[PDB]
Amino acid sequence: STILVIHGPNLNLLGKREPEVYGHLTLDNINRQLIAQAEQASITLDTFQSNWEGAIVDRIHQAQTEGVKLIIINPAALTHTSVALRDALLGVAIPFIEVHLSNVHAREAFRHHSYLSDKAIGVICGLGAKGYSFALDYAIEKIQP
Amino acid sequence: STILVIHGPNLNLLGKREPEVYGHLTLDNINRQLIAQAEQASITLDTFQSNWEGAIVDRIHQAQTEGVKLIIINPAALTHTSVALRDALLGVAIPFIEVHLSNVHAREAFRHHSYLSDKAIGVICGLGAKGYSFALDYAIEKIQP
Amino acid sequence: STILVIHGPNLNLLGKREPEVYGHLTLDNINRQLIAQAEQASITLDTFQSNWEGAIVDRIHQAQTEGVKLIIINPAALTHTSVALRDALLGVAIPFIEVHLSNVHAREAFRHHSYLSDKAIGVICGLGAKGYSFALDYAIEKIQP
Amino acid sequence: MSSTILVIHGPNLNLLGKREPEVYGHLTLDNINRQLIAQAEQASITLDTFQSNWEGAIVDRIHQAQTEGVKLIIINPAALTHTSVALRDALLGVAIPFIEVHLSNVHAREAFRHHSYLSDKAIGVICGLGAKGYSFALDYAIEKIQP
Amino acid sequence: STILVIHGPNLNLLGKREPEVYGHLTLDNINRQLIAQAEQASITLDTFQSNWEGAIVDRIHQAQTEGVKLIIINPAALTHTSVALRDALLGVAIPFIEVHLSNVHAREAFRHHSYLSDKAIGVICGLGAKGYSFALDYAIEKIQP
Amino acid sequence: STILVIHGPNLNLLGKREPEVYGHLTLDNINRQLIAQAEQASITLDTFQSNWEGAIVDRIHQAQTEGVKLIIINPAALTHTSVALRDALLGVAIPFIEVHLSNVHAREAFRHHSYLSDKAIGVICGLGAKGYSFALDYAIEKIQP
Amino acid sequence: STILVIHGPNLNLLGKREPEVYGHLTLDNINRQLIAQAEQASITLDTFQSNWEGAIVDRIHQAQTEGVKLIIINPAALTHTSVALRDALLGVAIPFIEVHLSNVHAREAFRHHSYLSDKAIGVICGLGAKGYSFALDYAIEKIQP
Amino acid sequence: STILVIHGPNLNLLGKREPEVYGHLTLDNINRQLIAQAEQASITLDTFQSNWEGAIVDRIHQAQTEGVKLIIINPAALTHTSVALRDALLGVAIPFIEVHLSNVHAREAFRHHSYLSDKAIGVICGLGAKGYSFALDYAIEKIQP
Amino acid sequence: STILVIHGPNLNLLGKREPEVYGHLTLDNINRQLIAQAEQASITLDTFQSNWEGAIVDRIHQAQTEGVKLIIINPAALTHTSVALRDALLGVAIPFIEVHLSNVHAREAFRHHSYLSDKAIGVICGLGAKGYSFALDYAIEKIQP
Amino acid sequence: STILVIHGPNLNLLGKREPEVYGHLTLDNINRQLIAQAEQASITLDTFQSNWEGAIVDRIHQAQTEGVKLIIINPAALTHTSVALRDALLGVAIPFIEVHLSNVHAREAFRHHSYLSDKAIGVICGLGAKGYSFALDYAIEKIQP
Amino acid sequence: STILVIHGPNLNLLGKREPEVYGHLTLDNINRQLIAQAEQASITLDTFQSNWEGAIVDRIHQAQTEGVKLIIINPAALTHTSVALRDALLGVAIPFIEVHLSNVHAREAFRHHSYLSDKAIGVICGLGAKGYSFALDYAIEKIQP
Amino acid sequence: STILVIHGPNLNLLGKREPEVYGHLTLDNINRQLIAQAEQASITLDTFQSNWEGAIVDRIHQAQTEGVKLIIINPAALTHTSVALRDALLGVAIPFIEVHLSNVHAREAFRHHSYLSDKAIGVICGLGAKGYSFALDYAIEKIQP
């Protein structure tokens, strides 16, 4: 794969309770949109979601051996807690863009601390699922001349 | 009606490291007592223990689909560290009670902070295994008012 | 008496102001429940409430002369401010359980601090008036297995 | 005058491109503005731009935006993000929603740059993606305003 | 009275519990020694103890009307909490020496802060009952060189 | 309609010590002025001062049973220390204006924090007794437009 | 004599941003009312609003030239950020009263800090536009007793 | 095994990405060296690595059941985040030595805090792979005097 | 080789208020002193004062296009608050020396923080007007040995 | 010697500078009072002052081999900075009383922290030279059965 | 009229390890430039360097007995640690100017705090050896206008 | 000397007399062991201990001039206090290894701060005397491949 999209814990819940509370959009809808968007630029894109920190770190190591040129990651809650994830990304030295659906600054003060943002190329928060599209747009421009 | 009891990391060792350090009470004994208690009010009681954060997050997602009405959780050490667990409980919107056998306020200062307590119905700490029963008792009465 | 229940300031308000705000349950109701629960096990139970910190300190000193084995205390606001209260309990060396009707951890940041919790056998918060019954059940069971 | 989108650029962004092109590329504030105007006009959205090194001018500009019918502000406040409560209270006082943009990754720099008087009140924030950040915010704006 | 000795909350417990392990010295023993020491110098000395903060503040007000020249105070736990007490002593402008039986720097970190010490002439902590005699000795020398 | 004016500890010392030092105005003088302003508006006005926190809490509870529409409180030292006072005012749900004679921000750092100000309608500090009269003016306009 | 009232940034919005949000009153209404009040007591009163820090600072420098006796200032957001403004007021040594329409202590934590309050005579917050009149009333009494 | 070696997340990357970035040395070379070293002493040694925190907790539990006498652990990023790991080691009560390849104190401030260091026998950092041989040397001497 | 001297807000008030407050020296005197010193060394020297942050930033930008080689800046109160000023000086990349008349370390704690000092060549404070001369001496010497 | 008195840096200046500033009392006067006081009770008493930390530490190691039973130390400025001095006293395990002439709590905030006070038997501050006599008075009664 | 220049620890190393890292200039050179400058103005100038804090303290005590009018001090590392040094300077009451060769603000955060700056007449940092000369120039002007 | 070992204050106390310790081992015992290990490797090794900071700084300056390749330092208490020590090791630019006998992370919170750790090659703590041997071991390998 060329672009790898990673989703952290609890994102599999998007759409799954009370459609109005969070709308109808699902994690699979988001993935579909991104696959199609990368097919239109003739880029191979893969995706991965897990609630387990270990699997996400294993996934990043595998990305190195697969030739991935850029990670788009929504670490979800792990932004605030996971030094392991920081070190997996630095270790394999694949550039990444951090994405959040919601504005994390608008929430509890503990959510203003990150172990990832300072090492990301850039960060997009609060723009919903479209944040991933923009991230992908950026990555496509930067990867093909 | 389903109630789910969740035990976090290291709670499997109860009873195992010496006859005396906090009892012969094992996790299995506790679980058996709570099972009996819940039968007597015709409540279905599930239990679950794991040392892996991700397994606990999965189990909570699973509870949403099972129509579990309330969660009694001893997150053990994850109380202090796991934002992912907080967001799992919030994401499924199943109300919960936090339980600890020991008094977390009597110990090191880093144990005074929690990512769950502020979102729990309530908290019971320091009353040993009976804390799980009290929480069950409370749950029984709040489900059939 | 064998067991003393102490209520701190403002708890005399319970169930006076607009009985559809926070319910129709007085301190009186709680004390009645508790007295009966204690009678069932042949334990003499005393109760006390005051808005005056000095009155509560005097009452704790009197408990010492009366051979009180354990104190169940809801200090309300005093949990955050009264080292005099911590020192009265430690000075008489009577073990105590701390109880709050509401989840103190869900309120303003200043309510996260206590001058009592770290010396309590245990704490129960947020489970309403039932918190006191649970505390009494534990106490009965520790005092006479 | 009337406009739907207002783009605000705070202090020092007029310097873009002008010191030693070697250092931080050849791209200028006017380049950025041209690109945003082209983009807006291509979606039939009216867009206006403003830059100043003076805080009170930016505040006046936001008050002016209220009487012009502006629906969304894309603001790169630059250094004012860390210091200007007045700016926050301007955006809030006129109740025009905004998106915050930074060319550079502000989390990658000094610790005093991690705090903002704006970010918590923004719809969202884009930092570190250079001039595309603005374009993405316009994108988002266009989709929210004319579905 | 020329000199007034004030004891804050809980100090009435001294000598009451298991005196052979927690000391046999009582507050009354302390008061008797200070009174004899003051009679020796032909100084009139009074004493007051209360568990109630408002009683102590009232007593400090009354001291101004009685022409007390100096106060020796062991505020006990109130040293850490009572601004009211600081504004009582400052409002009547009667100089004071702060005394503690025990060394407060050797206990919990919250006991290292005081609302009185910065305004006291000086402090004696950790020398037992003699702390009071020493304060008295200093006071006698000051009032009549 | 009653307004109640509460004065906290030490305010009884006003104008007693070297009236050349901090002024001639007494607490009774302040009360005389507020009663005149109230009577001029045909509003009933009650005043209360105590050095004891308990007396103040009880007084606030009584105000609830007496139909008091609004409280003007100068808590003096209690504004920095008394969560019980906060909870009494909130528990009776009578709105209130906080007054201080002096400018508390010009004094020691610990005097900058208040357990009341965030729940007051507003605060006046540093304008002497006129601060009370301003609060009362505001209150009269609020009750009888 | 002259009093000068200064209004800081964004106060020009008063009234205009929806009657819905905070009452019907406007900055010019406030200024009109205050001119009338000063004319009544034979005092000259000038007014000034600006969104720019330097315009305010220049205005205060001019006030010294004009022999202004007292400044009534609503700095709005600048109370939290502007050391320039503090040093302007201190530099011309014109005493001032700080005024806010809303209760700053009831809002975000960053609005509890001021670079002015400690050097003001006093502060009035949360009483609406009456805060300005009370300030004038205080100022008239200071100037012409 | 008498002695167990544990490597935390990301240590499997040693020697992979550009054998000139951090040399050619690999996690396998280290384990090789330590197994040989143990053999010379007639001590059985096991080794283990995982990116998943729960795997590491599980392996510590297993170690109790294997009679392991000492643990040499390089928790890597988990030293800063994992209370779960701390409580695993304390719960099985097996002494441990913490090892880090790099000087952890020379990097970002967040890397200076550890949930393990205070309960280790001791710590070795910054001495590359030899760190583990030294720990092993120490452990051999502790078990075979 | 042109040097630019920038004086920040309020420095235009030097001399004005009661000449005995810190003597008679005015901003104009200072500029004349430095203009002469610059002419004696055949160095073009420009000066600038403003109370407006914006004008100062515009000034620094124009300094780039004018080929200014070094700036001597007394930012007065803006040292503590203006990130915009920092970013202007780094944006144009003109080295600067920071000067203060008074000892900023001997005043309020807020004056101990600066957004300029860490990026200046160095800093002189508390040496009165000679501070600016010393800076120009250093600057002259740097610019033409 | 069974009692050693240590004076830290700068105490050698007592009396010296304008005896109409902080008295005519010198370090030697103090020593003399203490020596006579000790002689009256047939206890030998040694004294030592130095401005050098290492001399104080060496002096404490000596006292160990001299059978010194108690140290009375006024460490002066070292109480806030010297861990070496702390470790000396603890290393030799000679109990000590800390003395200061002035009320250290009435000064700068950095002066409230001590590396000694938590390990002293007790502390006396603010009572001038008599503080040393009081310490000695206690020490005599301690040493003697 | 004598001036004393004091150099703290490590400044003896100036020029020693690779004249090609931090110039060829030595402490001797600086001292030479200063003795010359002082001669030109008929001022007597003493100099002193030590790696030992007590030696520097003694040298300040000596400066008092020799009638030294002003001290120019580069305390190097001791500016962040030595309150003994602060109190020597204060205790002898000789005015001082603080000097540092480098910009301490541009280095580690612990280097921002000083025990001396707040009490110095002033401070010069980052202008190299010329800072001592400027300090001397200021001192000469103040001793003999 | 190719290698220099430095011991800081109070380590002279190791052995016989006892800083309340288990080991029986003395500072000379350690030194003999180290000299022997160094002779065996044909490497020359000097040692040094002092309770005087200044002496240690001097020793470090002398090491530059003696051609010392590497310093093994146990600074004991100085590791938390001494920036002069840090600046001496950086000044002479001799690489060092920091060694503590005890686990410094296991004791008081002030002991977790170091002014040396971040600039050492590495640190060993808690492994007693063997920590120094390990560090000698490492250095030997580094100086003689």
Curated annotation (Swiss-Prot), chains A, B, C, E, F, G, H, I, J, K, L:
InterPro entries (UniProt xref):
DHquinase_II, DHquinase_II_CS, DHquinase_II_sf
Q: Could you tell me the keywords of this UniProt record? A: Amino-acid biosynthesis, Aromatic amino acid biosynthesis, Lyase
Q: What is its EC number?
A: 4.2.1.10
Q: Where is this site: Transition state stabilizer?
A: R17
| NCBIfam families listed in its UniProt record | aroQ, PRK05395.1-1, PRK05395.1-2, PRK05395.1-3, PRK05395.1-4
Q: How does it assemble?
A: Homododecamer.
This chain belongs to the protein called 3-dehydroquinate dehydratase
Provenance organism: Acinetobacter baumannii (strain ATCC 17978 / DSM 105126 / CIP 53.77 / LMG 1025 / NCDC KC755 / 5377)
In the UniProt record, the gene name given for this protein reads: aroQ
